[model samples]
Target: GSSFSGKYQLQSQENFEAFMKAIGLPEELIQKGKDIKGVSEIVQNGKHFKFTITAGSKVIQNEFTVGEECELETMTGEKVKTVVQLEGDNKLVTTFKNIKSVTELNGDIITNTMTLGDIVFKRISKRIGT
Candidate 1:
């Protein structure tokens, strides 16, 4: 589980525009955010996690323990109350509103996938620094 703790810099993204549109992000914001290099930092301690997602000038910080219901903000800036689940030690799964988010780790790489109806957006990040 320690493998989940690190600073990850977004290397690539798939279906970025379409997915954000489905998530109800404004057109202007999505257009401005589309090609930015985002960074995600995860601080994990046992079942608790502190996640910081930085995209352009907006930063979202969320902290919650696994399996506990908490209010977490979505990428579109909506406050959603949901419980996060750690599955098989390598994946963290959560669903908010109609969006399903999954963060899977393989060594120094992390794949953050979000699904809303038929649209699936994927972000691949590589661990940076320590």
Candidate 2:
């Protein structure tokens, strides 16, 4: 997980929207706030944060962990993994320090390939509107 503290400034409305979509924000919430530009926030102290978002009167908050991990499955029953963290005052950083997708299990040798799509969604799901 990241620091779960500091001001996260959003660059633009499109970026925010893409971020929303990337994170699998339901269509209902997106639709409700689609036209409402300048939607953004600044997080601090876990779920306890604030925002200047224009999408709604109340800001949606997502707590990025200072230590977090993710695992994805491959067709061959192998797994891919990722770790997340934060850096400095303005950077919510993620480090893919470990990605093991090929292995032999139970004497069954196997190899697998991994793909990351809309990777942001997984992390974004960590904390939504809390």
* TM-scores of the models, in the order given: 0.95, 0.33
Alpha carbon lDDT of each predicted model: 0.90, 0.35
lDDT of 2 by residue, 1-130 (tens): 2233222322223233464454456767767655553333444565233323334564443333345665533222244465434334333433332322221111111111111343322111112233
Candidate 2 regions with alpha-carbon error over 4 angstroms: 1-11, 15-26, 38-54, 62-65, 68-84, 94-130
Count of residue pairs whose backbone atoms collide, per candidate: 0, 6
> Residue 28 deviation, candidate 2, in Å?
3.8
Clashes of 1: 0
User: RMSD, model 1, all Cα superposed?
Assistant: 1.1
lDDT agreement of model 1 with the native: 0.90
lDDT of 1 at 67: 90
Task: For residues 18-86, write the lDDT of model 1, one tens digit per residue.
Answer: 988877899998998888889999999889899999998899999889999988988778989999999
Shift in Å, residue 34, candidate 2? 2.0
lDDT for model 2? 0.35
